[PDB]
């Protein structure tokens, strides 16, 4: 029978023992494929991915006999793979991951005649990367993905990416990011844990360029609108103290409320960020406008108010334009 | 012929049936006719472009070694424990994003075997699958959410999925959704994939969803329209009452901002401009421009010449006030009609 | 020899095919099943579901399991031997997630009677969903159900029947937050027709009444107090401008913050709710009082003072009447 | 004598022991003594009326056919893998509302067998169990949260639980709770249930918890006292400073109402009136009445005689408000401290 | 000879190695040396008083009946499979509050057998263990957390644990904590417990976390100080602008007691007074006071032959202007000096 071929293949085959026990280390080629690259959770400094991990290697004990020929390969059922030997390919920086058996364990197994098997199990992982927050509205994040063994050493196991396309993403469509050309650098990354030895590693580095569109029309525009509103309030008769005063306190209160609302949602870090410095500058400008009005009122108690009023209404536009141009020159 | 002996004679140790080999090995690919029955839709949330569905998945196929000629009846239902002993397809969902079986009081799964060899296999599944959405017309959009069924352990030359010709996607009578209305028509087509390893058969189903305007209509529009009207009221106040005008403008702009902030804090942080956001931006621009024009009028009146330009600029100020007072409602009305005729069509 | 007796009942030497349904190809086997509610609650409209903790029971007869040798009639077994015989595969049509209990034992009770009756009981925790409408939110009444039906067989072979007397037993100490569970509970059938055959289905309907107290307390009472607050401000003469302006501004701020606190609790349902409309009318009345004072000042600033006083007093005598008629109409149309 | 043969002869294939039969079949019912060791309390939240506790549940019972008479030693410690082969009681928690074992590096379960046949079986469990609580005196309440243990697969005719006469509920010395204090005394009574089928043995333990009044005391009461005293200080000033007075009244009312709003959005929404709500409502009524009285005084103020009447009413309310607030405070505290 | 026969001879059906039997039964206690390697810290939360850690736990112990004398090599690496067939210590974490293994493509466990009989067994573990902290110095606090290791089904006379003399607790170089900094020194000691059923061996490890003030510093202090200086500027306006001034105050206090309510919104409800709370309260007291000063000066100015009280109001305004910033600076100095040490 056809199953008799795999029965003869598996007889006297102990999966607990790696191929070439006393021989050279086995080089296991690893291929990856992104299927649904989920968003990143800045609050948890992690991102969720769903991949079709693939492994191939050489197992001389699984060479096909002279009887069976086949077209290209004989694919056994997915449930058979519990009887084979596999590398302990785990993810070093994993926070939590799980298999998928919604209807059946999603594993594809191919066996070549010369004794090279391909095993592909679906994986769903939640990796973690150090989220840098400097220049937050235009940051360039780099999230890592490490693959390494745990139950062997560099003398028994080895991981090398395919010479072709190790990553073959079809479509990403991230809600607020985009990736075009990643790199497979930091290829070896060979871990060296004291007390056990050297473990093989391989790394993959992505590149995220955050879409500044949302924050451009979500936070920057209201702050600019409030600043312009304060400037227009500046164009009112100082004698109407009941009128000029509220339109500066409203500006500063709105700036403070916006800062508080938009600060508690981002992850907490102990260094300043571009959005925060922009908000601080806008708040300080509103505060300075209110203080200038106060000093104008003090000078009132004649043309003494007129000179300072015109000087400030001329200086504020140029000063804020200079600040805006230097900011967008230094952060873009 | 006792009922007990037949079950292990057709499938079991005495049967000599290898469950680890697909039907018709080294032959033509075996068809799988599969239809789904939605039982509880809902839980659609834009925060993760995903929704939770509960389905009864059914499959019908044929197997030459499953045919029997003993019982007069053709349909003989079988025990799920015996079901987990024969060949089954390895279909999965291309964008499951989290799923799990049901096991209350039993692993609920129905198996029926026909005399001619036809086999029907049905399970109950819950899918938190995801559909990439678009929010260009968010308060009035037409969404298309899909589910894809494809094999993973076989190639196109062994398995092929086909929908039932009549009554493909059955829907429960009591189905109802919040914030959405399920369209009657549902689309079906193929999604033949091409990975490194062979070609995998794939089918997909597409659901059209339309969003009820009501909640969004009232909350996102009525307060904004009312505060625009209130900002108009300020324009009817005489020039002298500067603090009243300033306070009313401040209140209106504060209400506009907050409302915009509250509206934006429900949707994914997408980059492209939505439909509601630009509308609220225009309303905020109206309010701010009204306040700015009042400030400009105040400056014009205050400026004065050195009967020392008499009431001439007071006249001019009243003229600009009246013309802007008659112009703003016309501009708002024409913009409103433009917006609601552009997005509705 | 209890061990050998149990084994010859079901096991290796028994020769009892567990996979075989009772009375194969014969008449259908009717099953009596009753539920015991032990812990209700955790009802949330924002997710349209509720959590229940029940002691599900099944009773029927197995002719090939009957014994006439052991002296006792009702013999209790263990779950380990329970997972060796045929049992119905009833599931919940709207389970929406559930799991067993595995604390120190799979808490399953099995009792085999001499004549053939079998009692089977399992602890179950169901987070099941019932669609709820908030059209009468401050006085809403809900109908939350629990469907039990078979999936592994057809109505031609399996039939479910609630116990004739005392079906839905309820623990005496059961309590709910902001809900009162009605005593009487409806029952009927739900025979469905799927693609392949028809399956037996049973139901048990629960009528739930939401407590009004908390809502009544925190929402309505401050609103009525500040409406009376506004009327007292209405009593004040127009000369004391700062006092009336303050009494109006404080009323407006308190009412708007109360409305904001009230609104942000419920799911984003399309149609208008019942609680908010009364809140909206109260906000309208507060704004109307403030605008009336503003218009009185506007007219006063412009022999018209007598007319201003006349309109002020007629509004003072009309607004309480309007509030009373609106409140009575609202309570009548909602309570009845 | 090798340990393997002894262990399999006591229980195993060679023993011929069936774990599916209770001790003393058709005989007297089996008493089971079970104490508890609280290891980590806390995470108690009123938003869903439950608390999570990590315990080392132990139970000792006599199995006559488990007795051995070979080793001179009396107490033998066992292995979990062979532990899961002998008869065990099926005790479960009637109000578990979710629970699970611990399997970290081992199924942490201890088995000890004595020569006479007494066996001790202990497992580490975590319970997210629910206790309904009343919030009549919420800032100063005392709660009685209970947990039950009862059989499910047997009858009172076969099983009966009983607490140890000495050292029933042992609590780790280092245990501490946030915003809560664990009373030392613990009630142990019986909860014998009468279900639809027979009687099931049941024993429950009741923990008395007290709420640390410090946090709520400060956060709620102190700002309210400060703002009402501020309202009084405003009351001291005469009627001429009308804008200052009305602004101060507005500030006080807004502060009181925002304190109440921020205080209320933490408790489970229950119909019956709490103890914080009445106090905050009284404070809000007091500040509102002060502002209303000032408005009325401003309204009553031409003829100098009306000015004298206004100052008389101002002084009488000035001497009245602090006395009324003090008597209310004394009444409230004395009634909610002895109740 | 062949690896299969040696593998089954060392343990398995032919060996007859009774896994459930502890090594050296009825003999001397078997000491175990165990060291852990932290791989990923972080996710420390104040609400639930716990933090999630990721560790590689290692245990080295000698099993005399496991010794082999066939292969020339002294150290041999096997797979997890045969690992799940031998005796293992039952160490469990005393305050884990839940945990789970890792099973991605394999239960990632490592077993290594030395020639003399020593065996090293290591597993990847994730622990959401609890740590009771105190918030007496919340914005400038130092927290000490513990992770005890102890047996569950044995006795001190049978099992004893000892930390490694060198390289006891290791940390990856790439380690970085959110909002925290980890101290280099890691104090370790014993935690020998006395339960009802005998005495159980116990060792423990302590970590010292220091909270970086930065995020809290800016997001709390800076807006409050800005609002306080806003109140100061409001206080620097002549009384003739009576409404606007007071209006500023109405906002000035209001937003403040909002921000205070915000600060405790992300912190657990604890009975004892925090450290940011007192600074929070002092700022609130200073602003309202400023408002009260404005009310008092308005009262004294509008009391009303028209020069003495006006001059007194101007003088009190001047003294309040020259005092309040100085008093605020004095308060800031003592607050920072007191809470620094
Ligand atoms: C990758 O890692 C090994 C580990 O020692 C190192 O010697 C070398 O750089 C690489 N080995 C290869 C590529 O075979
Ligand atoms: C369906 O099965 C038949 C016979 O096996 C054959 O046509 C083919 O393999 C399958 N596909 C189609 C499209 O017919
Ligand atoms: C079950 O009830 C049906 C009712 O139509 C009856 O025909 C049948 O005989 C009953 N069977 C048993 C075993 O009670
Ligand atoms: C067990 O409990 C019962 C309770 O009635 C008692 O009569 C009996 O003496 C106790 N001892 C045993 C183990 O039978
Ligand atoms: C382990 O170390 C302790 C302390 O030195 C010693 O008493 C014991 O005999 C040792 N056990 C073994 C098996 O080496
Ligand atoms: C069916 C969609 C309706 C959208 C709202 C239309 C409003 C028209 C009137 C605007 C004044
Ligand atoms: C449980 C401690 C109680 C301390 C005394 C509180 C007094 C509050 C009233 C002060 C007027
Ligand atoms: C952690 C260092 C802090 C240095 C002092 C900062 C003072 C900021 C406020 C100045 C008014
Ligand atoms: C490019 C970023 C430089 C940051 C310098 C330190 C903070 C300055 C705050 C004004
Ligand atoms: C005040 C102007 C500072 C400009 C800093 C420029 C830094 C460039 C790297
Ligand atoms: C650790 C960063 C401190 C930044 C302080 C900025 C102060 C601006 C006035
Ligand atoms: C929006 C009003 C602009 C007015 C410009 C000045 C016209 C003389
Ligand atoms: C915003 C006011 C602009 C005025 C320009 C000068 C008009 C003569
Ligand atoms: C005011 C009373 C209306 C009638 C109520 C009738 C209730 C059955
Ligand atoms: C409260 C500090 C400033 C002084 C108030 C007025 C003194 C009569
Ligand atoms: C007359 C006031 C002098 C300044 C006092 C400052 C107190 C800190
Ligand atoms: C936005 C208007 C700016 C005017 C500048 C005049 C010098
Ligand atoms: C207003 C200045 C904009 C500069 C943009 C540089 C890319
Ligand atoms: C469901 C639509 C309600 C419209 C209300 C308009 C006032
Ligand atoms: C595509 C850009 C549209 C801008 C609209 C601004 C009102
Ligand atoms: C030229 C003025 C036209 C006014 C039209 C009002 C409807
Ligand atoms: C079907 C909706 C038509 C709206 C027309 C608005 C002018
Ligand atoms: C049943 C409630 C009736 C209320 C009547 C209010 C006038
Ligand atoms: C169903 C809507 C009823 C409204 C009643 C208003 C008095
Ligand atoms: C126990 C100490 C209470 C002090 C209260 C001060 C208002
Ligand atoms: C580091 C950026 C500083 C910008 C100052 C205007
Ligand atoms: C879809 C295009 C909309 C443009 C609105 C100005
Ligand atoms: C463009 C508007 C069309 C309206 C038809 C009724
Ligand atoms: C307004 C009263 C209605 C009564 C209907 C029975
Ligand atoms: C205010 C009275 C408190 C009494 C406490 C025993
Ligand atoms: C305000 C007094 C309440 C008394 C409750 C017994
Ligand atoms: C600032 C104190 C009051 C002024 C007279 C001493
Ligand atoms: C310990 C708190 C001191 C506060 C000094 C203003
Ligand atoms: C240690 C910092 C002290 C700062 C005093 C202004």
Residue numbers in the entry:
A (entry chain E): 33 to 333, 445 to 475
B (entry chain D): 8 to 313, 381 to 419
C (entry chain C): 9 to 310, 386 to 419
D (entry chain B): 8 to 308, 383 to 420
E (entry chain A): 8 to 311, 383 to 419
In the authors' words:
In the presence of glycine, two structures were resolved with widened pores sufficient for Cl− to pass through. In the other structure (gly-2), the orthosteric sites at all 3 α/α interfaces have clear glycine densities, while sites at α(+)/β(−) and β(+)/α(−) interfaces are empty. Nonetheless, the pore also dilated in an asymmetrical manner, but to a larger extent, resulting in a minimal radius of 3.8 Å (m cyan), which is too large for a physiologically open GlyR. The gly-2(expanded open) state showed resembling but more extended structural rearrangements near the desensitization gate—two of the α1 subunits (chain B and C) moved in both radial and tangential directions, creating an asymmetrical wide-open pore. Intriguingly, none of the α1 subunits adjacent to the β subunit experienced such large movements, which we believe are resulting from amino acid residues unique to each subunit type. In addition, a similar “expanded open” conformation has been recently reported of full-length homomeric GlyR in SMA nanodiscs, suggesting that it is not specifically resulting from the digitonin detergent that was used. In contrast, in the gly-2(expanded open) state, strong and connected densities are found in the widened α-α interface, with stronger and more inter-connected lipid-like densities in the pore. These densities suggest a more stable occupancy, likely structurally supporting this conformation with wider α-α interface distance. In the case that densities in the pore represent hydrophobic plugs, they would render the channel non-conductive in this glycine-bound state. Over-widened pore is not likely a result of truncation in the unstructured M3-M4 loops considering the functional equivalence of α1emβem GlyR with wild type.
Here we report near-atomic resolution structures resolved in digitonin consistent with all principle functional states of the human α1β GlyR, which is a major Cys-loop receptor that mediates inhibitory neurotransmission in the central nervous system of adults. On the contrary, the heteromeric GlyRs containing both the α and the β subunit are found throughout the central nervous system. In all the structures determined, either with or without glycine, 4 α1 subunits and 1 β subunit were identified, consistent with the recent discovery of 4:1 α2:β stoichiometry of human α2β GlyR and heteromeric GlyR purified from porcine tissue. However, due to the distinct characteristics of the α and β subunit transmembrane domains (TMD), symmetric activation in ECD resulted in asymmetric structural rearrangements in the TMD, leading to asymmetric pore dilation that is distinct from homomeric GlyRs.
